[PDB]
Write a protein that binds this ligand. Structure first.
Ligand SMILES: [K+]
Ligand SMILES: [K+]
Ligand SMILES: [K+]
Ligand SMILES: [K+]
Ligand SMILES: [K+]
Ligand SMILES: [K+]
Ligand SMILES: [K+]
Ligand SMILES: [Mg+2]
Ligand SMILES: [Mg+2]
Ligand SMILES: [Mg+2]
Ligand SMILES: [Mg+2]
Ligand SMILES: [Mg+2]
Ligand SMILES: [Mg+2]
Ligand SMILES: [Mg+2]
Ligand SMILES: [Mg+2]
Ligand SMILES: [Mg+2]
Ligand SMILES: [Mg+2]
Ligand SMILES: [Mg+2]
Ligand SMILES: [Mg+2]
Ligand SMILES: [Mg+2]
Ligand SMILES: [Mg+2]
Ligand SMILES: [Mg+2]
Ligand SMILES: [Zn+2]
Lengths: 101, 50, 178, 208, 100, 139, 71, 137, 61, 65
RNA sequence: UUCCGUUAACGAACGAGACCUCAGCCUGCUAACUAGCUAUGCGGAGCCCUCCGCAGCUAGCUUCUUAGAGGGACUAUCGCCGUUUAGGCGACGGAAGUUUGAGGCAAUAACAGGUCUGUGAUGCCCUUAGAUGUUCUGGGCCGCACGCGCGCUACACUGAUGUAUUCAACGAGUAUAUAGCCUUGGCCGACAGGCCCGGGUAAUCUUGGAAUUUCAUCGUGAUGGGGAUAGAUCAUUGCAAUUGGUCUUCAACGAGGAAUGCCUAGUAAGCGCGAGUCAUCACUCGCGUUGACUACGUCCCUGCCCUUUGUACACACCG
């Protein structure tokens, strides 16, 4: 009852993958159906900037590029058990959001 | 004192790190000049890939 | 056979009256003869690869000039179809035969470089012939009533008296004087 | 509410601001980075220092904890800030960077100061070290002078995790001297020393 | 003379492609014939259409000489205007202007 | 017999869904005979005009094409129909017929069974095109 | 080009020197043995080492070489 | 047994359906048929005197093919190349009031209707007419 | 007009390396071996036409 | 300057009729360049041909006989 | 300076390679209601069959898109060559036989190369109060008889113009104040522009995402190629005029001297899209589309590297 959606946002693939597997297996511990994990399309932030502080010299541009990875999990369960499952420890770089679904 | 409308333009935006009125990057609300932003790219999380 | 150019032209009639330019022209009616000269194949990879390419492909690819015409192979093959119909309907023969006759009569034999005169590669011979024909058609088509197909047809029959034959004449004259 | 992109940029620039603020206050103690985590209802921001007994002074740490709470409009009782001791002072690049800065500012000759720092980094157990000092030392003309030894890679992906580098601009009496310190870290599979992965050129063999 | 009326009246000043189109089709005149064929029984109609735009339901914005300094219809030097005296458009004339 | 075959060229994918019947051929819900431009139409009748309608006289074809350009989509369907007709016999009829049609298609053209991998490479900075650079004026 | 880095040459020589007993002629067997008898990070470096070892087994099956020793 | 909009090519379909609207004689015409240009980037207004009926047939086929498109969508699909002189060419839209007007007339013919999803949908009678006229090809 | 078959290629020669010097034999008389030069691309086993069959050449021109 | 005629007389009207069976090729461009007539009048003449049918059709060229 | 070997050297550090990112293949796995495929059921038209839309909290699946772990290629087999090494050429196969392509990082030694006008980086000299900062007002950098530099638009009929088919990726997009961003839809307005219904803090909404291609008027004419330049006019942005709509005006220009720059494959060339710039106004960074000619050789020129050699140079031949 009262399906719950959890969103996992990060920049590192390894941390997100390990915590997603951990959370899904923890949900499976309570014998709970889980639809997922759903690998949200990664979003890329691209920025280009000129290295030279003054425009002198041949124009060379560096291209910084950041990746944002996301996973989403839907659990058909009461929210309290979802909070119990996610109450366990976390690793750096991963943000957890919970919503009513 | 500051009677001219500074609601926009380079007279209202400065680099958050240094404070220049030129070279202001604004994409994703960085609000900094290119030199200061390139100095702290590793700090922000901006790392070269290709 | 079951393969015909635009389902209209039969390849099993055209031969080459020379034993030096056979393999460089894909006109044999056993393979290398296609439905139309438009194919997304790679032929610049290795040396002598374009010899396997059909002759009609070479002719239609050499027309995408000048810089306002490249990337428009569709117009190129449409124009080649129009000029092909013109040639066949006028001459009452296989247009492939006229194309082959024009190419085999529009290839220079000797040049002079370094100044000493010496021969020409057969692949370079057919390439130069095709380039000369396309440039002559372009010259006859610029600032004129004629469309592309008409001048292409006229230069093709006249080369089977023409721009390409006179260019070959002057090149061979320069060569044979040294 | 605030979109994910703007929030991520805000935390990135906020961490950079925190680093700049803390590195310009703990010059007497050797600020050596910060770790920030977001637990449910808590935002933990632990400062690192080579000398920790002086960071505590623990009232000053509580003032610096309120610093981020009230300057950045963070909620009360949701932000924590403590101090921590370096695992290895020598293996930390910035630690030896400001150590050399302090040594040259005190009155020691720069050459002797870099020899001391160079001995200390090998005391820690570095694979290799490099110290570059650029600027005017005694003469009007500026010069670049280097002391390097040990393994010193210079290119490729391994350069950004198998080395630790630090650069500083020490304001001397006659100008500004630029100092750079680079330390190579060995392969520690646990990861406490340096990287947790071996080098591409380093291959180990099990005897038959 | 030989050009189509679609663009035969382009030659006369004050009329271009647009007004030629607005006149050759508002008099119910044939369009796929040249001007040499056109005779007097339609020349009067053409001049009537051209000379009386507003009375012929010309859209009011179509007229070129609009609301003179005061009627919609089809000195700067003396008043000392920057437009009459002068490039008025305010152009970077550092490089251009090399015609004399 | 219902199979999925994807024909990819550049950035155009033609997904063909098979079903037994009377050999109806449709692209994007529109007949194969209405391929536009009609002059490149023979490019997409290559498998029908080479293998023959007797091969596909009892199973229909329905294809949906997405992405790429017009020529890329034409090549995508050109290879997708070929893949689907190999899958016609590979999974539902026999081995010898599928083998022989694959060999005949290969001997006609390699692209009919092999997807050409040429893709557009990224453009480099400091120049106009991907590989071309600006005009160098020394003085 | 296709010439081999001194690292892969050396490691191939050592693995043949100490593990000539079981290692066989096929490239895939060579790599599946390499992955557990030695720690190689790059998979394509491992593939290069396995192919090089196969080439030296081709060399040695006709006669001795100047590289390996023991027995 | 039946030829449907898919089975008959768009060019001959739109010309035949424009003729269908020509002899239908039910839908109205504006007072600005010749004068107004279908797009601002266009220089010469459509030289065809009956351009309006060809355009209306284009709408009649478009709403059959896809539904839910608003005035802005039709303004977009009828855009094209705008050459600004010595400046590089770019993209431009088409006229909006004329498209709004012709869509309103098509509602008055009952060929389409408004939707809760935004845009217009084809009504059963209009697509029935298109189906039988395709069958008459 | 003495058609000749390229028998061996002696490497690119000339100022720019544009000319390629080859050895040929006549199809009318196989046993006669001459040396000539050819522009463009030439591979072994090809058949080449000419005009004058009396001109000679040199090795590594 | 080629000053081709803008309106055709009965002269061209019947010469084209006489020569259209015997012309192995009839095209608007060749007709315009040979009979000293405008391309538009060549188009009109080819439509008169289609009316009489003494024999492709394309936006740029016309090939018939 | 990659290796094999030769060896008064042996053993080692950098650089290269190794490394990392992306693309290229997987009917294998992981699993998808913010993504899809198929069948069925219902409704739409000409039972079935062609056919469009809607559900089925599982009809089934992940072949199609997404993203992860993995695999795949290593030159192994074939022939020849080379020394019987290092390896090279041509073969089958394979998605790939160029380390597959493209990039990121990239050693020592220097330049009096650039930047004090990016920096609460800084030493010295100078202003430090009729201030060289500070706040506003206005102007100016936009000058033009003239020389040069990077690009945009053309010289047209392979085209302009007017109808009608229609196929992409990258990214970006709100403070809710009525509402600052992306804007859907309806209405009004020829167009430019305005009002209302609202959605999206985002794979949900924008996002349903051109050259080219049938058809015709031109007709070789500085002409409907071209639109420089002008006038009249409306409105948007901005506190304050930049741009954009309509018509009229219709300049040079008919492939360009000496010289000169880029490029070898989905590349050049052609066509657009996004972002940065931004109260308003597009060159640079990426994205995709159409898509070829030749070459696959060389040191002739312009250079770079190595060996031998000559030197009266060492600021090093601009000696
Ligand atoms: K700046
Ligand atoms: K001037
Ligand atoms: K349009
Ligand atoms: K049904
Ligand atoms: K500086
Ligand atoms: K200063
Ligand atoms: K003009
Ligand atoms: Mg290395
Ligand atoms: Mg490297
Ligand atoms: Mg006029
Ligand atoms: Mg799949
Ligand atoms: Mg692999
Ligand atoms: Mg200097
Ligand atoms: Mg300052
Ligand atoms: Mg000041
Ligand atoms: Mg100016
Ligand atoms: Mg530039
Ligand atoms: Mg057009
Ligand atoms: Mg598309
Ligand atoms: Mg013009
Ligand atoms: Mg003009
Ligand atoms: Mg600029
Ligand atoms: Zn700054």
């Amino acid at each position: 009852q009262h399906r719950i959606r959890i969103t996992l946002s990060s920049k590192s693939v390894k941390n997100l993958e390990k915590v997603c597997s951990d959370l899904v297996r923890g949900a499976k511990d309570k014998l709970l159906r889980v639809k997922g994990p759903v690998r949200m399309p990664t979003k890329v932030l691209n920025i280009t900037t000129r290295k030279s502080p003054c425009g002198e010299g041949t124009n060379t541009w560096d291209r910084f590029e950041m990746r944002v990875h996301k996973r989403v999990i839907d659990l058909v369960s009461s929210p309290d058990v979802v909070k119990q499952i996610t109450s366990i420890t976390i690793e750096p770089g991963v943000e957890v959001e919970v919503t009513i679904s | 004192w500051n009677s001219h409308p500074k609601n926009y333009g380079p007279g209202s935006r400065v680099c958050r790190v240094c404070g220049n009125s030129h070279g202001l990057i604004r994409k994703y609300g960085l609000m900094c000049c290119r030199q200061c932003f390139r100095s702290n790219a590793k700090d922000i999380g901006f790392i070269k890939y290709r | 056979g079951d393969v015909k150019l635009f389902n209209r032209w039969t390849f099993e009639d055209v031969q080459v009256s020379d034993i030096s330019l056979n393999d460089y022209l894909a006109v044999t009616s056993m393979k290398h003869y296609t439905f139309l000269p438009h194919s997304a194949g790679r032929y610049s990879a290795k040396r002598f690869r374009k010899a396997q390419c059909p002759i009609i492909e070479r002719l239609t690819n050499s027309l995408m000039m000048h810089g306002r015409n490249n990337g428009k192979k569709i117009m190129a093959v449409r124009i080649i179809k129009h000029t092909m119909e013109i040639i066949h309907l006028l001459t009452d023969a296989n247009p492939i035969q006229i194309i082959v006759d024009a190419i085999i009569n529009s290839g220079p034999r000797e040049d002079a470089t370094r100044r000493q005169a010496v021969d020409i590669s057969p692949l370079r011979r057919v390439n130069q012939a095709i380039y000369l024909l396309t440039t002559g058609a372009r010259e006859s088509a610029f600032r004129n009533v004629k469309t592309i197909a008409e001048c292409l047809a006229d230069e093709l029959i006249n080369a089977a008296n023409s721009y390409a034959i006179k260019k070959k004449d002057e090149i061979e004259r320069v060569a044979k004087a040294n | 509410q605030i979109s994910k992109k703007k929030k991520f940029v805000s935390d990135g620039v906020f961490y950079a601001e925190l680093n700049e603020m803390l590195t310009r206050e703990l010059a007497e103690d050797g600020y050596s980075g910060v770790e920030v985590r977001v637990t449910p209802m808590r935002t933990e921001i632990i400062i690192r220092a080579t000398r920790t007994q002086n960071v505590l002074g623990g009232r000053r740490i509580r003032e610096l904890t309120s610093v981020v709470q009230k300057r950045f409009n963070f909620p009360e009782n949701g932000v924590e800030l403590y101090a921590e001791k370096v695992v290895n002072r020598g293996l930390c690049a910035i630690a030896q960077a400001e150590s050399l800065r302090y040594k040259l500012l005190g009155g020691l000759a720069v050459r002797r100061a870099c020899y001391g720092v160079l001995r200390f980094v090998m005391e820690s157990g570095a694979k290799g070290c490099e110290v570059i000092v650029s600027g005017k030392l005694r003469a009007q003309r500026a010069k670049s002078m280097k002391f390097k030894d040990g393994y010193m890679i210079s290119s490729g992906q391994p350069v950004n995790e198998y080395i630790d580098a630090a650069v500083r601009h020490v304001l001397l009496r006659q100008g500004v001297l630029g100092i750079k310190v680079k330390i190579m870290l060995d392969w520690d599979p646990k990861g406490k020393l340096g990287p947790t992965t071996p080098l591409p050129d380093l291959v180990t063999i099990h005897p038959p | 003379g030989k050009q189509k009326i679609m663009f035969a009246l382009t030659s006369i000043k004050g009329v271009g492609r647009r007004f030629s189109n607005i006149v050759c089709k508002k008099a119910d005149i044939d369009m796929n014939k040249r001007a040499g064929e056109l005779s007097a029984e339609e020349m009067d109609r053409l001049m009537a259409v051209v000379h009386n735009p507003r009375q012929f339901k010309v859209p009011d914005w179509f007229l070129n000489r609009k609301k003179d300094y005061g009627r919609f219809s089809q000195r700067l030097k003396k008043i000392r205007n920057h437009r009459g005296l002068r490039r008025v458009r305010g152009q970077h004339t550092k490089t251009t202007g090399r015609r004399g | 017999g219902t199979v999925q075959c994807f024909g990819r060229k550049k950035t155009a994918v033609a997904v063909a869904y098979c079903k037994p019947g009377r050999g109806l051929i449709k692209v994007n819900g529109a007949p194969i005979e209405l391929i536009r431009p009609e002059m490149l139409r023979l490019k997409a009748f290559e498998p029908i005009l080479l293998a023959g309608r007797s091969r596909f006289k009892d199973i229909d074809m329905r294809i949906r094409v997405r992405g790429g350009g017009k020529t890329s989509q034409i090549y995508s369907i050109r290879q997708a129909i070929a893949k689907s007709l190999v899958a016609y016999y590979q999974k539902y009829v026999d081995e010898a017929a599928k083998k022989e049609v694959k060999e005949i298609f290969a001997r006609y053209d390699r692209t009919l069974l092999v997807a050409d991998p040429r893709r557009c490479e990224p453009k480099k900075f400091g120049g106009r095109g991907a590989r071309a650079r600006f005009q160098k004026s020394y003085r | 080009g296709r010439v081999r880095t001194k690292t892969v040459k050396k490691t191939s020589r050592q693995v043949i020197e100490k593990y000539y007993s079981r290692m066989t002629l096929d490239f895939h067997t060579n790599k599946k043995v390499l992955e557990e008898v030695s720690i190689l990070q790059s998979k394509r470096l491992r593939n290069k080492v396995a192919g090089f070892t196969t080439h030296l087994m081709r060399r040695i099956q006709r006669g001795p070489v100047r590289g390996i020793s023991l027995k | 047994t039946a030829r449907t909009v898919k089975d008959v090519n768009p060019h001959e379909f739109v010309k035949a359906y424009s003729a269908h609207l020509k002899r239908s004689g039910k839908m109205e015409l504006p007072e600005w048929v010749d004068i107004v240009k279908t797009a601002r980037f266009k220089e010469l207004p459509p030289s065809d005197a009956d351009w309006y009926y060809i355009r209306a047939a284009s709408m009649a086929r478009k709403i059959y093919l896809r539904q839910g498109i608003g005035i802005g969508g039709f303004q977009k699909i009828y855009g094209g190349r705008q050459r600004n002189g010595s400046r590089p060419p770019h993209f431009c839209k088409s006229s909006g009031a004329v498209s709004r007007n012709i869509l309103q007339e098509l509602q008055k013919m009952g060929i389409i209707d408004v939707d809760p999803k935004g845009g217009r949908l084809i009504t059963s009678q209009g697509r029935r007419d298109l189906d039988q006229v395709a069958g008459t090809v | 007009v003495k058609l000749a078959v390229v028998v061996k290629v002696m490497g690119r020669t000339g100022s720019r390396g544009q000319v390629t010097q080859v050895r040929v034999k006549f199809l009318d008389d196989q046993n006669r071996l001459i040396m000539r030069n050819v522009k463009g691309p030439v591979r072994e086993g090809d058949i080449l036409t000419l005009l004058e069959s009396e001109r000679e050449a040199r090795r590594l021109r | 300057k080629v000053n081709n005629a803008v309106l055709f007389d009965q002269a061209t009207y019947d010469k084209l009729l006489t020569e259209v069976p015997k012309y192995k090729q009839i095209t608007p461009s060749v007709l315009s360049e040979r009979l000293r007539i405008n391309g538009s009048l060549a188009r009109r003449a080819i439509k008169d041909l289609m009316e009489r049918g003494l024999i492709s059709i394309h936006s740029s060229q016309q090939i018939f006989t």
